[PDB]
Each structure stands twice: as C-alpha cells, then as structure tokens.
Design a binder for this molecule. Structure first.
Ligand SMILES: Nc1nc2c(ncn2[C@@H]2O[C@H](COP(=O)(O)OP(=O)(O)O)[C@@H](O)[C@H]2O)c(=O)[nH]1
Ligand SMILES: Nc1nc2c(ncn2[C@@H]2O[C@H](COP(=O)(O)OP(=O)(O)O)[C@@H](O)[C@H]2O)c(=O)[nH]1
Lengths: 475, 475
C-alpha cells in the first residue's frame, strides 16, 4: 500500500453553503488528479498539498493547519493541506509565472531581438520563487513526517524547485515531477538569466522521474541539460540524465481527457449559427492559442469561395487578463474579427468570452470544423474532448506544435500554426470534404483519442515512477 | 592541381578610372576569399562566380558573359564571372533574404506569438529563390563544363539551394557549402512554411561538406534534419547525415580575421573622448548587434558609480536601412542613447553612423572596453580584430551566443545578451580592473585570437572537403 503525497499549484475545492441547513460546506471538485489517485489499486492513503489562492482558502488553511480530510465516493478520502504563503511573496511568484517572464520562457513568447531584457525584477522574482519553493517543500515534508516510504508526486511548473528540496531530506523517496507545459529548445531556454536557467535545472534533476506530455519536450529538456550542465551526461535513447550521482528518467506521459467532463449554447449563438456551417476555435485568453492567425486564415479561405454560408465562433476563456500579453492577444483577435466582418459581411465571425465550461462543450458539439492551431501547447486537451463529443463529424485542424499532435496528428489536419496559407487551405479542404469521408475520419479520430483518459495518465505516472525508482535504487 | 570553382553572393570588385590615363579599370578587392584560395598550394586555377549587384557589375557581365580574367599579385589570376539575374527576381530574392523573412529565420527574430504570419508573399519569394538558385547552378556548371574534376566551393546563405543542383549534374564532384550565419534550433527552423523548411534542407544535403562557423550551428542543423526528414539518419558524434544515398559531413570551421585589414578617428570623436575612458560598441545596423541592450546596461552600470569620466560610443555601419527591422533597430538605439544622456548627462553616449572601415579600426584602437553582445551572431569577426589592434589593454564583453564565443569565450567576459544586470555588472567589473590584470588578459586574448586567420580558414575548407570527398567516394 503506497502512501501518496501529491503536490500541485492548486487543489480545486468548491466553497459554499448547504441549501437546507446553511452550514458552510467545502468539498473536492470531482475529476481532480487527487481524486483519481486515491482510487488506484496500490494506494492506501493520499495527501494533497497545494496553495491557498482564495480568501476562503486562507480561512480553511489557517483554521485547519495540518489539513482537512475530505470524503470521496466509495468511502475514500484525501488529506488536503493548503499552504498560506506570504501574500507579497505569493503575488510576485504568480507574476513570475505569467507571460511577464516564465510563461514566455516555456511557451515561446520572446523574439530575442527586442524582448526580453532582464533587470533587477527578474532577480527579485527568482529570490521570491525560492522562498515559495521552500514553502511547498516544508509543507510536503511535514505532511509526510510520519510516513515510512512516502511517494511524492509533484505537478505543475510552479513546483519545479521542489524535487531538489525533497531529495535533500528524503534521499530514498520516489519523486515524480510532471510539467504540463512545453520545454523550449536549448537555445531558447538559455535566454533566461544564468541563475534561473541553471537553478531551475538543479531543482528538477533530483527527481526520480520527470514527466512531460510529449516526446518533443523531453528532448528539449535533455538538450537544455547537456548544454547548461557540463558535468551532466545525457542519454537521448534511454531518456536519462546522469548528474552528481542523481539518475533521472525522462518520460512522455500523454493525457487526453477526463470522461467525467464529457448543454445549451451561449445566448444568441444557436440562432446566429442557424443555417450556417460553424467553424469553432476555442481556447484561453493566452497568446499561444493563436485565434488571431486562425481568423486571418479563415478570411484567406473565404476569399477562395465556398464559405458563403459559413460562420466562425472564436470561443474564448478569460484568464489572467491582467497580463499585458493576454490583453494584447484579446485586442489583436478583436481587430482581426472586426476586419473579418468588414470584408466578408456583418456577423460572419463572433467572439464569445466566458468561463461556462458547458457552453464550450456545447460549442464543441455544434461545430462543423474545429481549429486548435496553437503556436505551442503543452498538450491541449480540448483537441481530445471536442471530437469525442462532436456528433457532426467535424474535421479537426490541429497545430503540429501541440503536444497532442504526437498522438492525434495522424488523425487530424496537421498544420504549421504560423503559415496562414497552409491553414486557409486546410479550412477550405476540411469544409469541401463530403459527409462520408468526414464520418470515417471522425470515427478513426475518436478511436485514437478515446484511450487517453485521466485514469490511464495517472496509472502511467505511478507505474512509471515505480519502475524508475526500482532502477534508481539499483544504480 | 585542383580546378576551383568558387560561388558566392558577391565578388567585391572596385570600378573606377586610372588617374593618369582615364581608362576604366576593374580589379579585385584584396583580401577576398577567391584571392586567398588562388594562393594555396594545390590550386592550379580558380573561377569565381557571383551575382551582378551594381550597374558596373551588369556592364562588366554583358561585355564578358563567360567571365573576365583578373590579375593578382605574383602573377596569379581568377576568372570572375558575374551573373545578370532577372531584376524582378533578384530584387525579390534580396527581400527574401532580409529580416523580412529569411534573416529572421536563421538569426532568431520572431516571437512566434505575433510574428511571423506567412502569406502568399512567402510562396512567391520561394519560387523566385528557385529561379535565382538555377541561375547560379547553370552559371557554375557552364563555367565548369570543360573541367575534368571540378571542385565546388559554395558560400553564403543565398546559395543554400545550389549544392543539390550541382550534384544533379556532377554526381562525383566535391561540393562544399559554407553558411556564414547561425542555424536555428529545430523548433525554430520549422516555423518556416513546409515547402521552405524541407526544401532548403533538400538543397543543402547533397553537398559533400556543409560548413558552419560554430559547433552550435552544426548541432542545430543536424537536429533540424532529424526532425524534418524521417528518411534521414544523423550521427551527432560523427557529425554526419545519411539521406537518400547522400553522405554529408558537417564541419565547424571558425574564422577570426584577415591580417590584410589590420588611422584617423571619426570627426570630433577624439576630442569628445579626450579625458574619458571610452566604451565602444560596433556593428551593422542590424537588430542582432544588440546596441540597445548595451546602452541600457551601460546606464545600469553608471548608476552603480565609478563611471563618471566614462563615455560610450555606439559605432554603427549602415546596411539595409530599407528593412523595417533595421530602421526600427536604429530608432530603438537612438531612443536608448537619448535617455542615457537625459539621465547621466549630455554627451555621455554618442552614435556614429557611417560606412568607413578605417574609422571603425580607429575606434577599436581607442577603446578602453569593447562590447560585442550580439543576440546571436554567426561568428562576429569584429571581436577578433578589435583586441588584436587595441593597444590599450581593453577588456572585451562577448555574448555567449556569438559563434566566436566558442573560440574566445574563455578569454573574454562572456554574458547572456538578454540580461542587462549581468551585462551591467560586466561593464563595471571590466572598468574596475587594474592595469596589470587587463594587460595579462589582453595578451592571452590576442594569443587566442591570432591563429584564426582567413588563410587558415580557407585551408580548413579545402583540407576538410578533401577528406570528406575521399570518405564519400568510399561509401
Ligand atoms: N473553466 C472553463 N474551462 C473551459 C472553458 N472552455 C473550455 N474549458 C476547458 O479547459 C480545458 C482546456 O485545456 P487545454 O485545451 O489543455 O488548454 P490549457 O488552457 O493550456 O489547459 C479543456 O478541458 C476545456 O474543456 C471555459 O469557458 N471555462
Ligand atoms: N564597410 C565597413 N565595414 C566595417 C565598418 N565597421 C566595421 N566593419 C567591418 O565589418 C566586419 C564586421 O563583421 P562581423 O563582426 O562578422 O559582423 P557581420 O557584419 O554580421 O559580418 C569587420 O571586419 C569590421 O572590420 C564600416 O563602417 N564599414
């Protein structure tokens, strides 16, 4: 029976009051990673350590300092411990991860000619990240003080410094670090200031296993290590790092969707889309989602004819609008949608900006063509969800730089996300395709997407960690 | 006796009139590559094929379509053949090579989030590049039609398509291709439209040898091949590619300086610099030269004290001012220099913009600190010339992303060109260093730079090509 200690940037908890008694309730959101880990076979118990990121979170942590036991179905339970970081440190590290710095570092945001220019702001953000990293390590370790053989699962890029600190106190523990975002090319990674580009590698490599969604990110990580750490010896075939006694295995662990996640359309959208084939692009208000280039490509396609009764919905998820790169991205999309309507006709392209996840699934079902043309994406789960719920045999245009292209690229229209001509031709070809060809393609697409569930991904992590821990013990 | 056929974008020829007779003269500029190749031992004769890029070049070409024999010293000669391309095709290919496209592709200019967006303009530029590529191949082959065992030396990025066309007609010939600019990471190279990113590789790989200035570019090239061509088999150790029968060797061939290049200062500059230590940043009007970040770093250093009697000259070489990225780069430097003077005092930082190699060498000699902090640079020969002529024991700040850092990085202050804090600290430390420490460092620096001459680089090319041709013949 494994004793699991899961660390992640957030533990999705819903806070409200009971509709009958009014007593305050806090219970876990279904479909989380912790809820799935607790269901696995070799799991005796599980603790979930995450950050307090709301005012409710701060009360819950202060009022239950060592963690609260939350009941799942089937009589399972998790000890959820929320860390109350320093407010000033937390807010700076949160800015440290946005496109103001670290997001642009791992999601290919800088042109090098004009950006970035690291000042004292980067040195202070890095110092605050260290304090934030120790906050997690001490909490994880204190939560696992009484465990004989704790198993550590460290998720999200915010925790890349945690493995070294865990290994410092627990030399023999299995430590998995999983990064949900891409790893950039060695030349791109070393844009970062020296203390950050090397210090981040020093924090991850003591892990037993480092997991990414895609082979490409594992490859770039290995090249970044070989480039920056001369005493490190990499093996691209075996996917391993040898560094100061640490043996580290790099693993690709693709994720697709959670069945528990898979309603009506947003207000006005159904009537607006009536009588028209509906092109749908969906994604967060993040520059990587590439909705501006999608809109331009839809215009280049419409100039080629055949799109007279076709409209485009740019479904958008508001997130971190306070980041200049995100707001600018919305502004650039709004411009392109304005110019698209100014040439093709009023109400040809529409933007819908909201958090209703049911509205997005409703858009997935209605779509006649799905565009997921990210400039880069750690994986992009929407490109798995959308074909699985779409009952219209919609084609899928998928960027080759999405992590999901390694799994689904053969079953989609794979495109260079920077080439408007190629993307316009894919839009035109996808809509010219007949009903029978689209139906057979969508069946092959759904079959390729179905196996990549949350549970299989968690099983991949545990089995993978178990095997590399056995290996690291022998070597 | 080898029969050499050198191809390059330009053959530097000076046209004017005799000061006594007035008859028009056309003779080769000393120190060119062709003049040095003709001087080697195993060279019986040599033909130099290049583009006509002036009106004098066009009249010279029209009047000698098969080439004009130009006399060198010691009774040697080269057949210089200038190609008269189609003006509309030529002008489009020149734009194809500028930062409007291909320069940004190999010199890391795009942020991916907002640039680039390839339209029909890229498809047409590529078609014109093909026509331009055939112009060179037929000219090279027609110049080598009567040669029994021709040796082909193809220089400059404009000719990356030439090796395949030569190999098409001369299956057994030694073909060297040398690229003077960096090769980007595989993830970055594949920004380009599919027909370009693969078609450029298809044109390069039939070469017997592909040469770069730095190990990093050879590595990135190999990774680009392995990523884009599944039938290609690379060997990172042996530095080779196996593709459709072609055996291709990748070689690093560093170049430093030409002794023939190594006077009066620019007007006003000597008096302006009198009584002050002079920081000197020199480079073309190209965004990669990074003069904007150098000026900001000089300001961060000056805020730390110790620079009260120090001034900095941003020496600039106008080149392709018609390119938006170059003009914007000049504008951004002017802004930074304006704000530097508005904070530290009038006439602290000065820009000197003109094309005069003698003025730049004079600035090299006067400098007390040299900054060559390129965002990226294929090699950067200025970082070799400047310490070799500087008689003031000036320190050298050298960007780690310059190809020259592979040779001189250990002997300079190597910096991350994007970190203003690190670069400011290097400026401060370089100016705080005492006379004796700087003198021993400059002596070691000159000793490391001295062997990398033009002649040694040409010998590297011929010896390297000879060895790879013997290997390719056996296999
Ligand atoms: N909360 C919320 N989630 C959404 C919305 N639209 C889509 N989603 C979900 O967010 C996820 C998108 O993740 P992914 O495509 O990997 O891109 P990410 O933003 O980088 O995680 C999918 O599971 C969607 O079902 C929305 O409006 N609100
Ligand atoms: N024609 C001309 N050449 C210059 C000037 N200033 C410097 N140079 C030379 O141009 C060369 C610079 O090359 P390099 O540093 O490799 O950068 P590149 O411009 O990208 O090739 C050096 O040989 C300098 O001596 C100038 O004002 N005019």
């Amino acid at each position: 029976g494994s004793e699991i200690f899961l660390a992640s940037k957030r533990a999705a908890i819903t806070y409200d009051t009971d509709p009958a008694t009014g007593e305050p309730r806090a219970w876990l959101a279904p479909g989380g990673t912790g809820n799935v880990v607790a269901e696995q076979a070799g799991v005796l118990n599980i603790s979930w350590i995450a950050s307090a990121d709301s005012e409710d979170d701060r009360r819950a942590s202060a009022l239950n300092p060592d963690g609260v036991t939350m009941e799942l179905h089937s009589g399972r339970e998790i000890l959820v411990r929320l860390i109350r970081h320093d407010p000033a440190v937390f807010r700076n590290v949160q800015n440290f991860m946005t496109a103001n710095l670290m997001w642009a570092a791992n999601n290919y945001g800088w042109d090098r000619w004009t950006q970035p220019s690291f000042g004292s702001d980067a040195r202070e953000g890095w110092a605050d990240f260290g304090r934030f990293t120790r906050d997690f390590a001490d909490a994880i370790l204190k939560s696992s003080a009484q465990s004989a053989d704790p198993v550590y699962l460290v998720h999200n890029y915010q925790l890349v410094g945690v493995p070294a600190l865990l290994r410092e106190q627990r030399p023999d523990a299995p430590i998995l670090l999983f990064v949900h975002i891409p790893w950039p090319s060695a030349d791109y990674w070393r844009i970062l200031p020296k203390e950050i580009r090397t210090g981040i590698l020093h924090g991850m490599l003591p892990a037993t296993t480092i997991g990414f969604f895609a082979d490409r990110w594992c490859r770039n990580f290995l090249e970044s290590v070989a480039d920056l750490l001369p005493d490190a010896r990499i093996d691209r075939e075996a996917m391993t790092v040898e560094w100061r006694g640490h043996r580290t295995r790099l693993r690709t662990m693709p994720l697709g969707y959670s069945p528990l996640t898979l309603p009506q359309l947003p207000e006005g959208i159904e009537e607006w889309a009536d009588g028209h084939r509906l092109v749908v692009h969906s994604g967060r208000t993040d520059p990587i989602k590439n909705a501006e280039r999608a809109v331009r490509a839809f215009v280049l396609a419409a100039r080629g004819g055949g799109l007279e009764k076709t409209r485009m919905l740019v479904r958008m998820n508001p997130n971190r609008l306070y980041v200049p790169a995100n707001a600018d991205y919305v502004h650039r999309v709004e411009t392109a949608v304005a110019e698209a309507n100014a040439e093709l006709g009023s109400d040809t392209v529409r933007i819908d900006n909201d958090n209703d996840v049911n509205h997005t699934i409703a858009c997935f079902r209605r779509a006649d063509l799905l565009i997921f043309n990210s400039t880069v994406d750690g994986q992009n789960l929407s490109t798995f969800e959308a074909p699985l719920v779409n009952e219209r045999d919609a084609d899928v245009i998928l960027s080759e730089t999405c992590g999901a292209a390694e799994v689904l690229g053969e079953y989609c229209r794979s495109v260079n996300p920077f080439d408007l001509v190629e993307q316009a031709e894919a839009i035109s070809a996808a809509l010219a395709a007949g009903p029978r060809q689209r139906a057979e393609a969508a069946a092959r697409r759904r079959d390729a997407a179905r196996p990549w569930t949350l549970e299989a991904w968690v099983q991949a992590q545990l089995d993978g960690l178990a095997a590399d821990h056995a290996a690291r013990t022998a070597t």
